[PDB]
């Protein structure tokens, strides 16, 4: 387990994101794994059927050094710790970071806090 996603706004139960460590070192590309967050149920993490959220809304990327990056690819925006991030621009995530989507319509707001499993980096 790489990290736990805690949805603070109540729409989604606790979910953990995983990645086989042996195979992660077997891979060459500077980006080891990608988890997609979006309205499309094919995504790794489903954000729910909220029309203003993108089918593929944001990505969390596992870098070569056990680090996690946030990448926004949405139409309406992604917020990190209360600030709208630049689209298509990798942002390094830190423990307890809060990722918010749906800003602009109260009924659509969804906030998620990331809890990183330090045991995973150490296995790296």
């Amino acid at each position: 387990i790489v990290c736990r996603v805690i949805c603070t706004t109540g729409q989604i139960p606790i979910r953990d994101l995983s990645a086989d460590i042996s195979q992660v070192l077997k891979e060459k590309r500077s980006i080891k794994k990608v988890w997609t967050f979006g309205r499309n149920p094919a995504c790794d993490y489903h954000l729910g059927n909220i029309s203003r959220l993108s089918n593929k809304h944001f990505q969390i990327l596992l870098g070569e050094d056990g680090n996690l990056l946030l990448n926004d690819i949405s139409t309406n925006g992604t917020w990190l710790n209360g600030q709208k991030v630049e689209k298509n621009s990798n942002q390094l995530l830190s423990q307890g970071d809060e990722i918010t989507v749906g800003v602009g319509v109260e009924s659509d707001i969804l906030s998620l806090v990331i809890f990183i499993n330090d045991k995973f980096k150490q296995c790296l």
Binding site: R39, S51, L53, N55, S74, N76, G77, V103, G104
Partner: peptide
């Protein structure tokens, strides 16, 4: 494949 509803005038 339902296309996303886009913020326009009130986009952030």
């Amino acid at each position: 494949l339902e296309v996303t509803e886009a913020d326009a005038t009130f986009a952030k």
